[PDB]
């Protein structure tokens, strides 16, 4: 609410500095005076919850009574037609603002801190699970010769992308808490492109697992030729190369720049950025979400259409993939919707309940990576055994 008011002071100030007449100068002043009075009413973060009559609080409030006074002065001039004089008077109050009140602003809200700590918690929590949980999955598959299944080789691929994903989390946590990116450009590039690799390689593998189940079920004759592990490895590598059609351009495009007191990691789309940004944001929604989903739904639709333990086994393994597919969807469906709203429907983007909910369901996205290894070891018996065998 206050930074909003401080925003309109600054903005109206430079409207006066670019003005050509008394009316439009006057109007601007009259806005600032309102801004400065609703700002005076407000308590700022540096003064989190001091005595409503502490020296520092009395002193902050004073700064505004001063500023207002000066606005009523400039407004007396503009009223009398004295434009330039009103403009000069406006110049001196930018300073009088900064000299007195500015020392009270800039700090982070206690709520905001709480969010940051809450995130760091969840992140650390996800991170400790997923990073562990998928290193196990990756270790378990390679080590034990008994585990080289076509579908399991695809899982390896997921456990890899998920692992890589969950290695970036503490860096994001530190970025949130300390309000800056202290890790340098290379690692900025590393972290973002990893975040994109994670989305595509996952959803492409999950499409190919689905394609895999389908040929398994509906074309068991044909399957024997295409359902080998060596080939799954090949498709895994294809999934990665293909994904690099989106991952490498981000690798280059991602960069580190200083902005308004901090260092921030971000994407740099060739101008127009806001357009190309949307372009990509749509493609990621189509080609890493709906379009692969439609394929999966088809694959699964068709399977609605042999020995004792093998028929039971297919069912169990097939039913596993649907859950991980579904579990995936429900984790990412929230955030993929939110981002498309965020970048098309102009809602209110600074609200507590909004920002939190966004962050609190980006978190769900990343929670998908810690969930996976659990689902593997609770819906696959061989995984269930291995995980409680170790310890």
């Amino acid at each position: 609410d206050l930074e909003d008011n401080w925003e309109t002071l600054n903005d109206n100030l430079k409207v006066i500095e670019k003005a050509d007449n008394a009316a439009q100068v006057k109007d601007a002043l009259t806005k600032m005076r309102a801004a400065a009075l609703d700002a005076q009413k407000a308590t700022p973060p540096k003064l989190e919850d001091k005595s409503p009559d502490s020296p520092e609080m009395k002193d902050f409030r004073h700064g505004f009574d001063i500023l207002v006074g000066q606005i009523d002065d400039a407004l007396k001039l503009a009223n009398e037609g004295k434009v330039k004089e009103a403009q000069a008077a406006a110049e001196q109050l930018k300073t009088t603002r900064n000299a007195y009140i500015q020392k009270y602003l800039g700090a982070r809200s206690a709520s905001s801190l709480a969010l940051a700590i809450a995130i760091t918690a969840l992140y650390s929590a996800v991170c400790a699970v997923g990073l562990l949980g998928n290193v196990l999955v990756m270790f378990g598959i390679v080590r034990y010769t008994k585990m080289k299944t076509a579908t399991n080789i695809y899982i390896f691929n997921l456990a890899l992308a998920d692992a890589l994903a969950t290695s970036t989390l503490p860096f994001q946590s530190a970025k949130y808490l300390m309000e800056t990116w202290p890790f340098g450009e290379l690692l900025c590039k590393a972290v973002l492109s990893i975040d994109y690799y994670n989305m595509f390689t996952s959803i492409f593998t999950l499409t190919m697992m689905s394609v895999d189940r389908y040929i398994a079920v509906c074309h068991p004759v044909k399957a024997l030729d295409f359902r080998t592990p060596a080939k799954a490895k090949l498709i895994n590598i294809c999934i990665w190369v293909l994904a690099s059609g989106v991952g490498v351009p981000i690798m280059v495009m991602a960069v580190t720049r200083p902005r308004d007191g901090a260092v921030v990691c971000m994407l740099q789309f060739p101008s127009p950025s806001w357009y190309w940004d949307t372009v990509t944001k749509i493609c990621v929604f189509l080609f890493a979400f709906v379009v692969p989903i439609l394929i999966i739904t088809v694959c699964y639709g068709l399977m609605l259409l042999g020995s004792k333990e093998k028929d039971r086994s297919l069912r169990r393994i097939t039913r596993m993939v649907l859950v991980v597919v579904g579990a995936f969807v429900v984790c990412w469906a929230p955030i993929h919707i939110f981002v498309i709203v965020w970048t098309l429907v102009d809602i209110d983007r600074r609200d507590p309940l909004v920002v939190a909910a966004l962050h609190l369901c980006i978190a769900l996205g990343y929670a998908n990576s810690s969930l996976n290894p659990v689902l593997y070891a609770f819906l696959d018996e061989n995984f269930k055994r291995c995980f409680r065998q170790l310890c």
């Binding site: 994109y196 989305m199 921030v264 971000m266 955030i335 981002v339």
Partner: peptide, 4 residues
Amino acid sequence: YXFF
């Protein structure tokens, strides 16, 4: 995902 996502970011600036």
